[PDB]
């Protein structure tokens, strides 16, 4: 699991 961001 990635998560990239705001």
Same mark, same amino acid.
């Given at each position: %699991?990635v &998560? %990239?961001? &705001?």
């Amino acid at each position: %699991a990635v &998560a %990239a961001g &705001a």
